[PDB]
Amino acid sequence: SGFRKMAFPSGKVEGCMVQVTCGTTTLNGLWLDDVVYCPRHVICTSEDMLNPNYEDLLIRKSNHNFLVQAGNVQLRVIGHSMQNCVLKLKVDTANPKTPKYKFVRIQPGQTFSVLACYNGSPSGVYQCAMRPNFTIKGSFLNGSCGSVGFNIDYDCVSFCYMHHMELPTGVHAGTDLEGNFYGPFVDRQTAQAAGTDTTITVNVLAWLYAAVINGDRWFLNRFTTTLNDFNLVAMKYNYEPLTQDHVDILGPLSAQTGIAVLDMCASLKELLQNGMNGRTILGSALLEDEFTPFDVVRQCSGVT
Amino acid sequence: SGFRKMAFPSGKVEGCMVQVTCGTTTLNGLWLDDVVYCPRHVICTSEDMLNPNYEDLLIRKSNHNFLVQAGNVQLRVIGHSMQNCVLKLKVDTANPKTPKYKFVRIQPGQTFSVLACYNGSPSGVYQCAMRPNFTIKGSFLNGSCGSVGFNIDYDCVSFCYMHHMELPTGVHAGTDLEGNFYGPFVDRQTAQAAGTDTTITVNVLAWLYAAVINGDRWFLNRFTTTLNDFNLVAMKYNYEPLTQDHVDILGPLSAQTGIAVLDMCASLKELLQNGMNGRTILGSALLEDEFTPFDVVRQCSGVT
Ligand SMILES: *[C@](O)(C(=O)NC1CC1)[C@H](CCC)NC(=O)[C@@H]1[C@H]2CCC[C@H]2CN1C(=O)[C@@H](NC(=O)[C@@H](NC(=O)c1cnccn1)C1CCCCC1)C(C)(C)C
Numbered sequence: 201s202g203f204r205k206m207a208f209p210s211g212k213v214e215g216c217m218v219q220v221t222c223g224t225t226t227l228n229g230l231w232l233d234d235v236v237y238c239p240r241h242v243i244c245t246s247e248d249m250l251n252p253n254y255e256d257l258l259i260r261k262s263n264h265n266f267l268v269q270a271g272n273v274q275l276r277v278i279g280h281s282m283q284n285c286v287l288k289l290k291v292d293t294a295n296p297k298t299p300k301y302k303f304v305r306i307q308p309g310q311t312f313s314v315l316a317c318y319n320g321s322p323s324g325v326y327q328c329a330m331r332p333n334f335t336i337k338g339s340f341l342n343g344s345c346g347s348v349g350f351n352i353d354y355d356c357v358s359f360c361y362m363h364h365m366e367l368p369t370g371v372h373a374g375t376d377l378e379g380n381f382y383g384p385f386v387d388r389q390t391a392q393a394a395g396t397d398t399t400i401t402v403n404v405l406a407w408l409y410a411a412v413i414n415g416d417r418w419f420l421n422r423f424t425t426t427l428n429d430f431n432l433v434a435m436k437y438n439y440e441p442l443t444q445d446h447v448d449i450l451g452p453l454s455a456q457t458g459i460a461v462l463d464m465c466a467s468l469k470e471l472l473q474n475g476m477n478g479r480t481i482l483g484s485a486l487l488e489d490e491f492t493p494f495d496v497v498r499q500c501s502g503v504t
Numbered sequence: 505s506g507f508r509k510m511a512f513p514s515g516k517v518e519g520c521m522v523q524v525t526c527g528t529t530t531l532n533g534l535w536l537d538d539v540v541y542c543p544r545h546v547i548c549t550s551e552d553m554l555n556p557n558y559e560d561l562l563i564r565k566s567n568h569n570f571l572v573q574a575g576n577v578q579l580r581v582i583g584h585s586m587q588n589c590v591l592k593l594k595v596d597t598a599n600p601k602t603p604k605y606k607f608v609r610i611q612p613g614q615t616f617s618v619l620a621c622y623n624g625s626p627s628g629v630y631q632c633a634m635r636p637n638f639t640i641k642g643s644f645l646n647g648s649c650g651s652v653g654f655n656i657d658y659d660c661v662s663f664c665y666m667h668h669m670e671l672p673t674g675v676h677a678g679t680d681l682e683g684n685f686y687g688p689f690v691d692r693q694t695a696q697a698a699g700t701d702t703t704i705t706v707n708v709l710a711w712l713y714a715a716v717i718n719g720d721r722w723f724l725n726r727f728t729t730t731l732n733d734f735n736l737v738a739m740k741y742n743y744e745p746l747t748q749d750h751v752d753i754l755g756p757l758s759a760q761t762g763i764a765v766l767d768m769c770a771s772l773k774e775l776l777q778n779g780m781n782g783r784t785i786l787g788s789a790l791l792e793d794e795f796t797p798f799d800v801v802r803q804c805s806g807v808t
């Protein structure tokens with residue numbers, strides 16, 4: 201028992217990380233098969249960032265302008281293309297350590313593991329959620345661009361995130377592995393507001409189930425509610441509306457604990473209206489929303 | 505910027521995990537060179553656990569009583585010895601994926617990465633601290649025994665923890681890789697109280713420095729204090745005494761932020777005496793004590 205913010209084992213990803221240098225800009229790429237993927241702003245000067253025309257900037261580059269370095273050994277770049285906001289650099293060697301993998305776009309409130317990297321060297325792994333406003337609250341320094349987010353779905357690495365930039369609030373934005381930003385962001389140095397951040401209600405309910413499973417029961421009450429009346433209270437505390445699809449995906453946790461989703465919803469209503477009165481749940485003073493129903497099931501049944 | 509509970513990349517450890525079976529008991533071992541390390545209670549029946557004589561139980565076992573399984577391929581056990589509470593099983597193959605490694609005993613309040621495993625398959629990585637009472641608040645299910653804790657110190661894996669058992673409070677206990685329990689525990693199914701848990705004061709100060717570095721400054725005040733008067737207030741809130749060695753090891757964070765350790769100590773005194781008044785620090789409502797000074801320096805300077 202116990203409950204931790206747990207990331208996926210990062211070995212399958214650590215063997216795909218490389219250093220990509222173009223001019224004096226060095227960041228990280230993802231070397232799958234015979235393609236190195238990286239943020240396209242690797243081609244930009246600090247002046248270019250103000251208002252880049254990436255097509256004009258990329259046309260001025262040749263294959264030899266890119267240093268791709270897998271550990272010590274230099275890869276030969278034999279071709280470069282642009283897909284949305286990512287560069288795909290063709291190289292002369294397929295990565296032996298290439299695992300089985302898919303590219304996947306995740307939805308607001310899904311979680312993933314970030315392998316934070318500097319100079320193609322993996323430095324750290326942590327778990328986070330795609331916020332409803334499509335930012336992530338990561339930990340990224342200068343040089344972290346091209347670090348990736350992933351899930352491991354039964355020995356298949358699902359890549360969902362490549363790091364591009366940090367907003368002035370200290371939150372993070374980037375793309376899927378086909379180069380489309382999560383959220384309304386563009387890879388240019390202008391003011392770009394993230395939406396209002398909301399609490400991921402389905403995730404909070406998942407974590408309250410995790411608490412019950414671990415014997416933290418004090419917040420259970422005799423009350424019940426409708427989905428409508430819950431969503432009325434939710435919306436007032438800047439919680440995401442809860443949908444029937446959410447209720448469905450909570451079904452398995454409901455079944456295992458024998459607490460109906462709408463009964464648990466009644467516990468959360470009272471917590472929101474009344475606070476925790478100096479109590480904690482799984483040692484937290486705040487309601488946690490970075491665990492999906494599937495994370496709680498995985499960690500509390502123990503899939504490998 | 506941003507601040508996350510970050511674990512070490514687990515690839516170097518994932519390549520050392522094996523399944524160890526003896527009778528109907530299956531758990532995890534650590535396969536370094538030509539030795540598989542595992543909890544010695546792998547040899548016990550449920551009846552043996554009440555009061556085992558591990559020497560008598562081990563003498564009744566032969567090399568062929570142990571199934572060591574590296575992924576699919578069965579290792580041949582060619583010799584078995586007992587070191588304190590760990591078994592060392594000699595096998596017929598040295599692990600190619602053996603990284604550079606040391607065995608290290610950590611001190612109360614040091615942090616490490618746990619690779620949680622089931623059936624020799626790595627399932628998850630998280631960061632935690634050795635509590636002052638020598639328990640860890642892990643996430644471990646049935647089958648997790650033999651999962652290991654480690655640090656990566658510049659491509660050298662320092663193994664510090666092997667998982668043995670869970671106390672009724674849902675906290676965890678186990679050994680260093682030479683088989684000595686952390687804390688007063690023994691591998692027997694009897695009542696064994698953990699000490700009083702205290703807050704790791706040096707770690708809280710490290711994290712308050714992390715908050716300043718990330719622009720959370722509201723808790724800084726004009727007051728200062730002596731180490732003595734701080735420790736008087738600390739002891740009352742069940743915080744570990746702060747020592748000059750702690751003040752020294754905080755020096756680098758002090759230098760970078762230009763806030764003397766004893767000035768930061770004055771901020772923490774006021775937080776403890778007055779609470780946070782519904783405010784948060786790095787998004788937490790509670791003071792965080794599972795980051796060492798070295799973790800904050802690593803993550804806020806970005807070593808790989
Ligand atoms: C990454 O490229 C990297 O690791 N490079 C290696 C070191 C050489 C680097 C990593 C930081 C975590 N990212 C960037 O350099 C990105 C790119 C993409 C946009 C242009 C540059 C800037 N950038 C940033 O992350 C910056 N943030 C911003 O420029 C934001 N600026 C503003 O909010 C803004 C701008 N003008 C006026 C007013 N406000 C925006 C916000 C969201 C839209 C794009 C970026 C810094 C300042 C480096 C954090």
Ligand SMILES: *[C@](O)(C(=O)NC1CC1)[C@H](CCC)NC(=O)[C@@H]1[C@H]2CCC[C@H]2CN1C(=O)[C@@H](NC(=O)[C@@H](NC(=O)c1cnccn1)C1CCCCC1)C(C)(C)C
Nearest residue numbers: 553646647648649668669670671672691692693694695696
């Ligand atoms: C581990 O061996 C494993 O993964 N085995 C694979 C599935 C086959 C397993 C993992 C659980 C996280 N650990 C154990 O089986 C250990 C060993 C070591 C001590 C004997 C057994 C029991 N055990 C436990 O973790 C248990 N906990 C306890 O028995 C504790 N009991 C009490 O607190 C107690 C006992 N008698 C009376 C009153 N209270 C003690 C507490 C600290 C000293 C040693 C264990 C369970 C019940 C399995 C959690």
